[PDB]
């Protein structure tokens, strides 16, 4: 029992783009751009769709960099999140109803105002390593169990 989601990180040589989530799931935390994958689109098409909806950006190419599975206590469906990276983007990011975008220097990442699992795997993304992760949550703040490894194929 699982459902597909996407997450996109725009990572340039000296900065990374994050959005402050204004409503819905994860509101009040900085994150990459993404959401549910729809019927009739590929996983990559869904990532591009969410990036455009939430920031206005389009891209030449997306690269697969990780997979993370989330379990929330008392929720029947696991979340299967496919994580993508890009350097080159097309456009200037703008605010949407869902997200307020800002650039961050790579030594000033706001981990205290991010999902707690990001402190574990985001460092691997910044180091350009591919990864598989699993995190079990009780509510939105408490990690009960986790696994994390580097992989050769995402």
Ligand X SMILES: Nc1nc(SCCc2ccccc2)c2[nH]cnc2n1
Question: Binding site for 8-oxo-dGTP: which residues?
Answer: 6, 21, 31, 33-36, 115-118
List the binding residues: 6, 21, 25, 31, 33-36, 50, 53-54, 98, 115-118
Asked if residue 54 binds ligand X (CB under 6 A), the reply is no
Q: What are phi and psi of 13, to 5 degrees?
A: -55, -35
Dig out the tokens for 37 from the structure: 């994958």
Whether residue 111 contacts residue 118, with contact meaning beta carbons closer than 8 Å, is answered with yes
| Interface region with ligand X, contact rule CB under 6 A, candidates 29-37, 56-64, 85-93, 125-133 | 29-37
* Contacting residue, 86, 118, 130, 133, with ligand X by CB under 6 A: 118
Q: Residues of 44-57 as b/e, b for ≥16 C-beta within 10 angstroms?
A: eebbbbbbbebbeb
Footprint of ligand X (CB under 6 A): 5, 7, 25-26, 31, 34-35, 70, 81, 115, 117-118
């Amino acid at each position: 029992a699982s459902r597909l989601y996407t997450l996109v990180l725009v990572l340039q040589p000296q900065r990374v783009l994050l959005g402050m989530k204004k409503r819905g799931f994860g509101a009040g935390r900085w994150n990459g751009f993404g959401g549910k994958v729809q019927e009739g689109e590929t996983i990559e098409d869904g990532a591009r769709r969410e990036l455009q909806e939430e920031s206005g950006l389009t891209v030449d190419a997306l690269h697969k960099v990780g997979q993370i599975v989330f379990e929330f206590v008392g929720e029947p469906e696991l979340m299967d999140v496919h994580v993508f990276c890009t350097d080159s983007i097309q456009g200037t990011p703008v605010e949407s109803d869902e997200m307020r975008p800002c650039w961050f220097q790579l030594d000033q990442i706001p981990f205290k105002d991010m999902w707690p699992d990001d402190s574990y795997w985001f460092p691997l993304l910044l180091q350009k390593k591919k990864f598989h992760g699993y995190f079990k949550f009780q509510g939105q703040d408490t990690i009960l169990d986790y696994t994390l490894r580097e992989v050769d194929t995402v």
